[PDB]
Design a protein around this nucleic acid. Structure first.
Ligand SMILES: [Cl-]
Ligand SMILES: [Cl-]
Ligand SMILES: [Mg+2]
Ligand SMILES: [Mg+2]
Ligand SMILES: [Mg+2]
Ligand SMILES: [Mg+2]
Ligand SMILES: [Mg+2]
Ligand SMILES: [Mg+2]
Ligand SMILES: [Mg+2]
Ligand SMILES: [Mg+2]
Ligand SMILES: [Mg+2]
Ligand SMILES: [Mg+2]
Ligand SMILES: [Mg+2]
Ligand SMILES: [Mg+2]
Ligand SMILES: [Mg+2]
Ligand SMILES: [Mg+2]
Ligand SMILES: [Mg+2]
Ligand SMILES: [Mg+2]
Ligand SMILES: [Mg+2]
Ligand SMILES: [Mg+2]
Ligand SMILES: [Mg+2]
Ligand SMILES: [Mg+2]
Ligand code: NA
Ligand code: NA
Ligand code: NA
Ligand code: NA
Ligand code: NA
Ligand code: NA
Ligand code: NA
Ligand code: NA
Ligand code: NA
Ligand code: NA
Ligand code: NA
Ligand code: NA
Lengths: 81, 46, 56, 143, 82
RNA sequence: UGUCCCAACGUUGGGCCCGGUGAACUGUACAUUCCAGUGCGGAGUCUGGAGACACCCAGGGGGAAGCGAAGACCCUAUGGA
RNA sequence: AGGGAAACGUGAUUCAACCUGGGGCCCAUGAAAAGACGAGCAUAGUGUCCGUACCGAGAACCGACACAGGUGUCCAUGGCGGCGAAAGCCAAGGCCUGUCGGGAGCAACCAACGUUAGGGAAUUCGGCAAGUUAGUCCCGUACCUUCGGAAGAAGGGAUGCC
RNA sequence: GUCGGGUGAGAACCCCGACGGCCUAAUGGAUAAGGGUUCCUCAGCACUGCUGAUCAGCUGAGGGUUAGCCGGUCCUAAGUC
RNA sequence: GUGGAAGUCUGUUAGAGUUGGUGUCCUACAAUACCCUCUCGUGAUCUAUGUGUAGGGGUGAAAGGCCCAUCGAGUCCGGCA
RNA sequence: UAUGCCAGCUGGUGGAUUGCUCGGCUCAGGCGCUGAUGAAGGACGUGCCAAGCUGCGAUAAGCCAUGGGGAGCC
C-alpha cells in the first residue's frame, strides 16, 4: 500500500511560504486528494491543517501547499526534520 | 493545447530522460546519451 | 495553392496517439482504434503473415 | 553588465512600457546588483530608475481647422472627397427634418393655434414631403 | 587645441540614405590627419554626432565646425561641436 | 507615351577590393591552339602546316556536337495500362 | 475599501458593448438536451478530481532549416486625415533579430526605378511593358435596349487660402 | 543605425544613455490548435546561431504552474462505439 | 417624396481568387516562392472546429480533377529472387 | 626560376591489410504449453548520487525458508 506523504518539498519558494504564510509544502502521492493530504499531515506532525492546495508537477509527482492554523508554526514544525 | 494527467506524466518522464550521464558514471566506467531529444529538432510521441 | 509546402501549414491536427494497449504512438484518437495492435477493433492482437517473407 | 532583466522588472513595477524606463548611466553597477523587485522599487525611490513621459498628439492645429469649418470655411468643392450623400446621409436628414416639422405642428395644436383638423391636414402633407423645412411650413401655414 | 571646419562633401559618394554614418567617419578621418593621430585615438563628443544626425540619416550638413584638443601619453584628440 | 527612331544621364541593391563564414554542379586520360585534310560521313588529341614564353584578374558566353534527363517523336517487343 | 506625487471635476455631443422595439424576405422556415425559473428566510458544514509554465510565430506550431511559404478567434472606437476598418503622418505598445561586416563618386554588366529634346506605335504576332485618365460638385450625354439598362456614355465648367 | 560609455582575456552586432529610425488589424495586447519545459535563475561556449559573441530558444545544474465561483467535468449536435 | 430591393455596381475593409508581366527566382526564401498588375467581395459567399464517404471504391458545377509533394485506378507490406 | 610535372623521404589524413573474436549462420540431441488464482505484451515507477541497459514492483537491482557455497560482497 502507498503512503500519502512522500517528503517535504524544500526550496526557496517553499521557505517563503513557511516563513511568511505558515505553509508547509510536500511531495505527495498523486492519487491523494486534498483531504487525504490534510489528514496525513495532521497525524504525522500533530498540527491543525487549515487549507491545502495541490498541483501535479512536471516532475511526475504531486505537490501540496498546506497552510497550518495560526495556532501552529510551520517554521518550528519543519525545523525538527 | 490541453494535456491530461497521464500525458503530463509522460512528457515529464521524457524531460527527465533528457538529462546527461552523470560525471561519476564516467569514472566508474573508465569511459554519451543516445536518447537526447531537443524540443525543436526532435518530435515526441502521441 | 500548392499541395506541397503551402499545404503543410494546416497540419495541426492530432490523430495517432500513444496506444494504451501496445504503447506505440498509433492510437487514432478520432477512430479510437490503433493502427498497430488493433486495440479498439480486435480483442486479439493485430498480426498478418505478410509482415514477413512468406517462407519466414 | 547586463541590465535587461531589470528593465523588464522596472517596467512592471513602474507600470510602464519597457521602452520608457530609464536607467541612470552612472549607476549601472548598482542597478546590475538589483535582483529583486524590491531592489528595484528602492532604486526607483532613489531616482536611479525613472519612467519617461509618454507623448500625446497635439490637437492645436486640429482645433484651428475645426473652428474654420464650424464657421463654414475650408469645405469647398476642392476639399470634399466623399460623395455628397456620403457627407450627409439623406435618410438621416429627412428624419431630422420630418421630426422637426412634426414637433412644430404638435406644439401649435396643444397651443390651440391649430384645430385637430388643420393639424391633421398639415401633418399628412408633411409626411408627403410638402415642406422643405419648419420655416417653409410656418410660411405655408400663414395662408 | 584649435577650431576646425570639416568639409563633408565626400559623404555624397556614399548612398544618400546613409550620409550620417559616412560623415561621422569623415570627421574622424579629418582629425586624425590634421592632428597627426591614429583614428583609434580620436574621440568625438556626442554633440558632434547629434549635429551630423540632426535632420535624419540622409540629410547631413556640408561642413561642421569642430573644436579639438591633442595630448596624453599615447597621443589622442577629443572633439566637440562649437 | 523611351515600344521605336536612338540612346543619355541619374537613384537604390548588387557587382569590384578587404575581414569572417563557406557549399554544389562536374571530372577516362592528356590538354596553348588555329587553318585545312582525314576518320563511323560533325576531331583540342589522327595527318600536314601555321601559331604558341609562364602565371593571374575582369568580361560577355563562340566551341568542348558544354552541364542537366538510359529520347516524349519514330520503329521494334508473340511489353504494360 | 482601494489606488494616486497631486488634483482626487462638472456639463455636453456622437455614441462599440449591453438592452428593448418596428418593418421586410422564403418553391430556403433557420438544433437539441441538460439545466434554470415557477418555489421564502437564519445559522452551520461541505464544495473532492484534471488543466493552469511558456511560444502562439519573417526563431518555440506544419513545411528536413532560427524556411520571404502555410496557420483559427478577440481587440473594427487611439490622434490628424477622409466616405472610409483607405492612403499618408503620429501615439500607446513593440522593435533596430525580415541578423555578417569594412572600403572604392562606387567602372563594365544586372535587378528595381526617375527624367529625357524633336517625332509619337515608325516597335511588335499583338501597344507586350510603361504611360494617359483620376477624388467631389454643376452642366450635359449618342447608337442600341429585354425599358431594367446603355451611363461615371461622350463632352464642358468648377475645385486653395483669408 | 551612429556617438559616447558598461562588462569582459576578447565586443560592429551582450548591456546603459543620447541622437536617428522601423511596425499601427501589426512587428502591439489576449488566445485556439499544435509544440512540450522551450518559461525563471545561476554557471558556461566543445555543439547550435547564415560573421562574432561576454548573448541565446544552445550546453549543464537548480527552480517554477496553487481555483467551490476560469476552463474541463455535465448536456445534447452531425455523427461514433 | 418616402422606402431600401438586388446570386446589383465601386471598392488591396476583412477575406477569397489568381489575368498579364511569359518580370524576379529557377543548386530558390520556397520540391509551386516574391513583386506589380488583375477578379470576386450579401452570397450557388468566405472560414474554424467537429463529423460522414476508401481504392475498380470515394469525391467530382466534369479538368480524367481530387482522395496527405503519390492518381487514366492512393499508400504500405506480401505474392517476389 | 616563379606557377608547376614525375618519383621518393619525414609527418598527416584515411582505415584497407594481417592478426584476434564476447556475435552470427547451420546441423544435432533433449524438452515443450501459458491465461479470469488476470497471462503474454505495454506503461510508469524503483538506486546515496542513477541518463541508458538489466533486475525488481510502493516489501520495487529486492523480503523469507531449505539446500549448496564461502570470505568476501554492495
Ligand atoms: Cl419604430
Ligand atoms: Cl483553461
Ligand atoms: Mg488545480
Ligand atoms: Mg530541466
Ligand atoms: Mg496529391
Ligand atoms: Mg433614399
Ligand atoms: Mg600539328
Ligand atoms: Mg532510350
Ligand atoms: Mg506515342
Ligand atoms: Mg493491353
Ligand atoms: Mg499564463
Ligand atoms: Mg531569423
Ligand atoms: Mg520624348
Ligand atoms: Mg507596325
Ligand atoms: Mg516592323
Ligand atoms: Mg498593360
Ligand atoms: Mg530565457
Ligand atoms: Mg547570463
Ligand atoms: Mg455583387
Ligand atoms: Mg468589387
Ligand atoms: Mg471539415
Ligand atoms: Mg481529356
Ligand atoms: Na521529489
Ligand atoms: Na518538437
Ligand atoms: Na524610361
Ligand atoms: Na563558351
Ligand atoms: Na477618424
Ligand atoms: Na547581429
Ligand atoms: Na417610390
Ligand atoms: Na499574381
Ligand atoms: Na486500386
Ligand atoms: Na513483392
Ligand atoms: Na522445452
Ligand atoms: Na542508470
Amino acid at each position: 500500500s502507498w503512503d500519502v506523504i512522500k517528503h517535504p518539498h524544500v526550496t526557496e519558494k517553499a521557505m517563503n511560504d513557511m516563513d511568511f504564510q505558515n505553509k508547509l509544502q510536500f511531495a505527495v502521492d498523486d492519487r491523494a486528494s486534498k483531504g487525504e493530504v490534510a489528514d496525513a499531515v495532521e497525524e504525522q506532525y500533530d498540527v491543525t491543517v487549515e487549507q491545502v492546495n495541490t498541483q501535479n508537477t512536471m516532475d511526475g509527482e504531486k505537490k501540496a501547499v498546506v497552510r497550518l492554523s495560526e495556532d501552529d508554526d510551520a517554521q518550528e514544525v519543519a525545523s525538527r526534520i | 493545447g490541453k494535456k491530461s494527467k497521464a500525458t503530463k506524466k509522460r512528457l515529464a518522464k521524457l524531460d527527465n530522460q533528457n538529462s546527461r550521464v552523470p560525471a561519476w558514471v564516467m569514472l566508474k566506467t573508465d569511459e554519451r546519451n543516445h536518447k537526447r531529444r531537443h524540443w525543436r529538432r526532435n518530435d515526441t510521441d502521441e | 495553392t500548392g499541395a506541397g509546402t503551402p499545404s503543410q501549414g494546416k497540419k495541426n491536427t492530432t490523430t495517432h496517439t500513444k496506444c494504451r494497449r501496445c504503447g506505440e504512438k498509433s492510437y487514432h484518437t478520432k477512430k479510437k482504434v490503433c493502427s498497430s495492435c488493433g486495440f479498439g477493433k480486435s480483442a486479439k492482437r493485430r498480426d498478418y503473415e505478410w509482415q514477413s517473407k512468406a517462407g519466414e | 553588465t547586463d541590465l535587461s532583466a531589470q528593465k523588464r522588472l522596472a517596467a512592471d513595477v513602474l507600470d510602464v512600457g519597457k521602452n520608457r524606463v530609464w536607467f541612470n548611466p552612472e549607476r549601472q553597477g548598482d542597478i546590475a546588483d538589483a535582483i529583486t523587485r524590491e531592489d528595484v522599487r528602492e532604486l526607483v525611490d532613489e531616482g536611479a530608475i525613472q519612467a519617461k513621459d509618454k507623448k500625446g498628439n497635439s490637437r492645436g492645429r486640429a482645433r484651428e481647422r475645426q473652428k474654420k469649418r464650424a464657421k463654414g470655411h475650408q469645405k469647398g468643392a476642392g476639399s470634399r472627397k466623399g460623395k455628397a450623400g456620403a457627407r450627409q446621409n439623406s435618410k438621416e436628414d429627412w428624419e431630422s427634418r420630418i421630426r422637426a416639422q412634426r414637433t412644430k405642428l404638435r406644439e401649435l395644436r396643444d397651443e390651440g393655434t391649430l384645430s385637430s383638423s388643420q393639424y391633421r391636414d398639415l401633418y399628412d402633407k408633411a409626411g408627403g414631403g410638402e415642406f422643405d423645412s419648419v420655416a417653409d411650413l410656418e410660411r405655408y401655414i400663414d395662408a | 587645441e584649435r577650431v576646425v571646419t570639416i568639409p563633408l562633401r565626400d559623404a555624397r559618394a556614399e548612398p544618400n540614405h546613409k550620409r550620417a554614418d559616412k560623415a561621422m567617419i569623415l570627421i574622424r578621418e579629418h582629425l586624425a590627419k590634421h592632428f597627426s593621430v591614429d583614428e583609434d585615438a580620436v574621440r568625438l563628443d556626442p554633440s558632434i554626432n547629434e549635429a551630423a544626425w540632426a535632420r535624419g540619416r540622409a540629410n547631413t550638413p556640408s561642413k561642421i565646425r569642430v573644436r579639438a584638443a591633442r595630448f596624453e601619453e599615447e597621443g589622442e584628440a577629443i572633439v566637440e561641436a562649437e
